[PDB]
Design an enzyme around this catalytic site. Structure first.
Site, mmCIF file in Angstrom:
data_model
loop_
_atom_site.group_PDB
_atom_site.id
_atom_site.type_symbol
_atom_site.label_atom_id
_atom_site.label_comp_id
_atom_site.label_asym_id
_atom_site.label_seq_id
_atom_site.Cartn_x
_atom_site.Cartn_y
_atom_site.Cartn_z
ATOM 1 N N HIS A 136 46.838 41.817 35.192
ATOM 2 C CA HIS A 136 46.617 41.877 36.571
ATOM 3 C C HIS A 136 45.396 40.835 36.982
ATOM 4 C CE1 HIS A 136 49.553 44.813 37.203
ATOM 5 N NE2 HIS A 136 49.186 45.355 36.129
ATOM 6 N N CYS A 138 41.974 40.079 38.989
ATOM 7 C CA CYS A 138 40.747 40.863 39.536
ATOM 8 C C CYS A 138 39.925 40.025 40.357
ATOM 9 C CB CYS A 138 39.956 41.560 38.368
ATOM 10 S SG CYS A 138 38.339 42.151 38.959
ATOM 11 N N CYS A 144 42.885 36.662 35.759
ATOM 12 C CA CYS A 144 43.667 37.531 35.288
ATOM 13 C C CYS A 144 43.287 38.119 34.160
ATOM 14 C CB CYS A 144 45.043 36.875 34.931
ATOM 15 S SG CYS A 144 46.224 36.419 36.414
ATOM 16 N N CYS A 152 35.289 48.366 36.417
ATOM 17 C CA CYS A 152 34.398 49.325 36.437
ATOM 18 C C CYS A 152 33.150 48.621 36.925
ATOM 19 C CB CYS A 152 34.285 49.990 35.153
ATOM 20 S SG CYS A 152 33.391 51.674 35.276
ATOM 21 N N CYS A 158 35.176 43.907 33.693
ATOM 22 C CA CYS A 158 36.360 44.358 33.844
ATOM 23 C C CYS A 158 36.717 45.079 32.412
ATOM 24 C CB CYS A 158 37.409 43.144 33.953
ATOM 25 S SG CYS A 158 38.714 43.621 35.166
HETATM 26 ZN ZN LIG Z 1 37.136 42.530 36.995
HETATM 27 ZN ZN LIG Z 2 44.691 35.741 38.051
#
Ligand SMILES: [Zn+2]
Ligand SMILES: [Zn+2]
Ligand SMILES: Nc1ncnc2c1ncn2[C@@H]1O[C@H](COP(=O)(O)OP(=O)(O)O)[C@@H](OP(=O)(O)O)[C@H]1O
Ligand SMILES: [Zn+2]
Ligand SMILES: [Zn+2]
Lengths: 289, 294
Positions: A136, A138, A144, A152, A158
């Site tokens: 996903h 962010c 990605c 967090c 991430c």
């Molecule tokens: Zn992140």
């Molecule tokens: Zn992306």
């Protein structure tokens, strides 16, 4: 213009805040509790035992915490990106039907077993890549993230495929660090309430800061023990991935035992250590079916 | 002037020991505990060894550091000849009257010992009257209270301030080497009989056992000697030349009994006995005598 520098710096504020509390906790437990309070008592055996044990939990906590912060999250490989020819055809195209045809032809040459809620190819508009399964985007990392769990804030990073086992160990050693403090300061917390001026401020703060962090972080730890056994990220726990046979919350599950080994690995000696031991590459995952 | 050269070259034994200890830390933690024991697939012994090792390594480096940088105690300014007494002492040509100048000053000081010739123990270089058990060291270029001996391995004198730290340094050296030898032995066996064959780990595991065993067998003799000196309340110098009191030489002139002799060095609080924190009784310029007079 210079908004990046202030934005980048303010992201470290939760890290520096946690770092201060940990440094203060070391000073409070070692100097105030063990040296002034326990060593203020005539018991040399109890002081050494606590000091040795404390340094074991403090090391495993700082080691796991450091690893969760500076382990950079893995990004999709070069194969998932649209080539400079096909991304032109995608940007030139105006019909969504033909856009999907461009993405479906490249994606069928990739190990992708999931689609979007509308059965469309999971694609990242910003990164201009076809998202691997469980990956996903962010907007904080502006990228990605493979097997993304969540961004967090407390680690300014991430928590993804690379971080997850470190993040879990960080939680584990947080409870142990705080539980050990609370269990050992309690005997003296009872005494402090029922007279050193400086020692009380730190010992009193030590007990319920460790207790508050214990009761708080313990909820998250039980939450993730569910997640690891189900082979579900936090994102997937809110939106189950859609496979060729429809949505399936258990689409990546391989059984409780095998799901844990995807995160912690087959090497039993590395389970408790903040050393990367997760199976796979993050761009593809074994399917239940 | 070679006093400047002495200061720099004096650190060579200290830096050498520091190298062996740093090397021992890397060899035991990385080569022995990480590559060797953790390769054997059970982290139960590895954590225990790594935890225990850091306890001995800390107490050893702490004691060693304290013995090096604890400055040796010097006599109080009362023991120095005042600008008045240094004149009349320098004017006199008869040695008999020179002693009377020193004797008059010594009788105003808690001094219960003399030289073998019953003369006042006086230091020509420092121009002071040596307190009991105090001696001049030309390496430190000073008089050292309750001087035991000048130690090159710490680039310092072992005196009234250092002695308990020096003793703990020996104790934690033996324990550090014993712990290494006892734990590396099982793996020292493997490398010779080729159960383990790692090229880098072999050099460090073999050297770890030899160096720890060689340091243990050597320091153990020295440590037992000092455990006997403490019970007799004798410095190393006094064990070779008994001090001369008003009633003649007496190797046990400062003895107060075995229990009280140890307490002079380590103190009454047991919590400080094993810690490199100063807990020695007295001031180093005067000591209780066995018979009479403090
Ligand atoms: Zn992140
Ligand atoms: Zn992306
Ligand atoms: N410059 C020095 N360097 C090292 N040791 C010294 C020095 N001066 C005196 N000593 C020590 O003190 C002794 C030398 O003679 P003294 O008894 O007169 O001592 P002092 O002159 O230092 O007060 C030596 O011990 P030993 O005769 O029993 O073998 C020596 O250890
Ligand atoms: Zn002198
Ligand atoms: Zn000296």
């Amino acid at each position: 213009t210079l908004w990046r520098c202030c934005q980048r710096v303010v992201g470290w504020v939760p890290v520096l805040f946690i770092t201060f509390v940990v440094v203060w906790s070391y000073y409070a437990y070692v100097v105030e509790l063990c040296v002034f309070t326990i060593f203020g008592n005539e018991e040399n055996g109890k002081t050494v035992v606590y000091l040795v044990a404390f340094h074991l939990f403090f090391v495993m906590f700082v080691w796991s915490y450091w690893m969760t912060i500076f382990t950079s999250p893995a990004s999709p490989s070069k194969e998932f990106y649209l080539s400079n020819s096909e991304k032109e055809r995608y940007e030139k195209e105006f019909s969504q039907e033909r856009q999907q045809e461009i993405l479906r032809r490249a994606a069928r040459a990739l190990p992708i077993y999931t689609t979007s809620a509308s059965k469309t190819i999971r694609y990242c508009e910003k990164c201009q890549l076809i998202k691997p399964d469980r990956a996903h985007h962010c907007s904080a990392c502006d990228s990605c993230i493979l097997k993304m769990d969540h961004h967090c804030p407390w680690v300014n990073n991430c928590v993804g495929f690379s971080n997850y086992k470190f993040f879990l160990l960080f939680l584990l050693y947080s409870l142990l660090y705080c539980l050990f403090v609370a269990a050992t300061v309690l005997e003296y917390f009872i005494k402090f309430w029922t007279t050193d001026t400086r020692a009380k401020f730190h010992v009193l703060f030590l007990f319920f800061v460790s207790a508050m962090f214990f009761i708080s972080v313990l909820s998250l730890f039980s939450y993730h023990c569910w997640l690891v056994g189900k082979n579900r990220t936090t994102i997937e726990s809110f939106r189950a991935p859609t496979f060729s046979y429809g949505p399936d919350g258990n689409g990546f599950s391989l059984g409780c035992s095998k799901n844990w080994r995807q995160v912690f690995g087959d090497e039993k000696k590395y389970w408790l250590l903040p050393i990367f031991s997760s199976l796979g590459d993050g761009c593809s995952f074994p399917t239940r079916l």
